[PDB]
Symmetry: C3
Subunit: 273 residues, 3 copies
């Protein structure tokens, strides 16, 4: 609805996670305020050009990592991106690994998730009177997944092509007994705190959303358990590789997602009562 | 406490789920407002006669399916039914199946549940200073379960005589990875969104509550995953069968539940500290 | 910050659970009000002497068991203990058993937990702008665990030396289908309602916290399922044994926890961003 400055539009949105507070990537950056019915997004959205494509960057934790996962205004964030006209959303996230072969420094492009959050307050945009139940069997946008995998391959980085993300509430990390459940019982591959309800809202807004995850740690399974400082250090050390992948992929997103490879692109057709 | 019109009482309550917004079933219908300490119930309660038994009908989603599962005022709904004097509560619900032999169009009368909700805000009526911990090992009222099973048999419908209901938060449906957990790990039979905390509150109010579930879909396991429109279509197509079962069962509920086959009928005796 | 009376300090904190509303244990008891940014703790804190060590006792449910698990102001409780200067926290709790050999009347000193709560509203003290993710792989303080185990042995009581606690939301007890999940799928040992988020907050405050649990029931697995009255009766019958253990252990806590056996004692060093 209202933006300041007025008239700003973008085509691709990038949501930065741990370690990614600035868009080193955009040219001609303008900071934009976007009105939402839910109040403030995490920070200003930075809009600029990447090889002729207009990109909107939002740090989910705000600049300086000021907002922990449970306190993020997920509704405002996704509303603001949708209001700017974006069709594609790339999320860049730090995750823990629950398997030896998904190693620190590897990328993962997950294809499934399990929601073990509890305190996020709103899991939908739709509280009535139109009841909306989106289908999320295949919750990520395949068109964008495949493009991230291809970019990673071309640049020579390791990119695991599948993975189930278990989303936990936090902010504490898991106990050993919990980690054993995630790994041995649920057979999840990676773990983080921020995917839900971000992905649910992206789907409801009919966006093509995918996650580019970077493994930062092995959860409770190494000699030393994960610490926050380790996650941050690992991300900051590798942010250059994530930036290179974004510069590779974004120019290829000049067009529209293919409907047959975008499960949420027409989610509301069959979902609203 | 206060009702408008004044003096209205009922013996059986029916909570209608998806597809069941009107009580085609009652005669001499009066719309009733019932005061509750929790504000508005989902809609007016309709009170009328079914073969000499006074029945109170409440659509949990409101008329026109205006209230999604996470936004229902469960406390107000159950308080209002209790205030009218009801002893028996039949819930009619749409569920998904996690097993091939529980097929779309079949009825299920579940005997257990697993609560995987997270955002329902109140799971009890008792916040102190009297602490109440009801026993819910066998959470449904057996007297009423057995009567529903018998009615279904007599009318010639398929009624599965047991089943564990996994209650999920929604409003989105499950991912494939989540559905695999419900089915393969938890070994649940059916899935829905509305049972909790409705059943907890019914037990605390010492009501005899049972669910008549209708299978509308196979969750994420068919060629096509579940959509909201499919659930609604399937329910509306079969609502006649549900109405026939209610007309059969309600006249047999002229009496009181048998205490030895009503786990919650004296729940508060041993539960309050 | 502000206390009334002013100037009160304590070294050991004891949080009493079900059945333990008074500190039969302390001498020279003074009731203390401690300001917190979160409002009222469960009750006054009672401060007094046990063989030369200053002890602060707080009943988590308040006197008279007025506050059920979901309504406890966990932040206020832990803030108030920290403000008084305590370094050690002993929690005394009633738990259910999920295994035949952990019998009613036995003590358990758990070493792990699984959090299955959903409605506790705040799981941390840190909502930003400093983001804090504490490591809780080994969530209890080992120094204090070992001292409780030793005391139990010396007095001749059965004390199980390990156990995974599954924390459920309540206030209703588990269904049979849920209990089967806790026992057979998650392989938990004991069950209760109060550990989370108490333990998370204790860790964030850099306290040495451990639980002395008493088994009061076998959950849904005996001839009769658990009832609230049974739990209370069993605790009140055995509170003398718990008091004897506290009198044995507290004089040995005159010193400081050993850092190498206190996982949370420097939790914030690596946890804050
Ligand atoms: C900066 S440390 C906190 C961040 O770590 C991410 N994360 C990385 N490793 C893990 C892990 N092992 N478990 C949970 N979240 C993790 C979470 O999404 C969170 O926002
Ligand atoms: C009208 S579509 C939404 C309703 O479908 C019911 N339901 C039917 N099938 C499923 C399913 N597969 N998973 C979850 N809830 C379902 C839920 O209880 C909800 O209120
Ligand atoms: C006084 S009855 C309620 C208390 O029982 C404790 N508890 C004892 N047995 C169990 C059990 N089987 N399941 C859950 N909590 C239990 C809980 O922590 C709660 O505060």
């Amino acid at each position: 609805e209202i933006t300041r400055p007025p008239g700003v539009r973008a085509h691709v949105g990038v949501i930065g996670g741990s370690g990614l507070y600035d868009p080193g990537i955009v040219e001609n950056p303008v900071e934009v305020k976007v009105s939402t019915p839910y109040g403030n997004p995490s920070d200003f959205i930075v809009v600029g050009d990447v090889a002729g494509v207009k990109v909107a960057f939002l740090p989910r934790h705000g600049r300086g990592h000021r907002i922990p996962p449970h306190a993020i205004n997920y509704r405002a964030n996704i509303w603001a991106l949708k209001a700017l006209g974006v069709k594609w959303v790339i999320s860049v996230s730090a995750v823990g690994s629950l398997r030896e072969d998904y190693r620190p420094g590897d990328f993962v492009v997950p294809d499934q998730f399990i929601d073990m959050t509890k305190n996020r307050r709103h899991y939908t945009f739709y509280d009535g009177p139109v009841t909306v139940h989106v289908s999320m069997a295949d919750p990520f946008c395949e068109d964008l997944r495949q493009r991230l995998i291809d970019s990673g391959r071309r640049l020579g980085y390791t990119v695991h092509e599948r993975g189930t993300y278990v989303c936990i509430e936090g902010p504490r990390f898991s106990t050993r007994a919990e980690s054993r459940v995630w790994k041995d019982v649920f057979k999840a591959d990676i773990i983080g705190m921020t995917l839900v309800p971000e992905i649910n809202l992206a789907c409801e807004a009919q966006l093509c959303y995918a996650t580019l995850a970077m493994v930062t740690d092995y959860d409770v399974w190494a000699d030393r358990p994960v610490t926050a400082e380790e996650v941050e250090r690992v991300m900051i050390s590798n942010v250059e590789r994530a930036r290179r992948m974004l510069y590779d992929v974004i120019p290829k997103l000049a067009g529209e997602p293919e409907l047959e490879r975008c499960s949420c692109c027409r989610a509301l057709d069959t979902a609203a009562i």
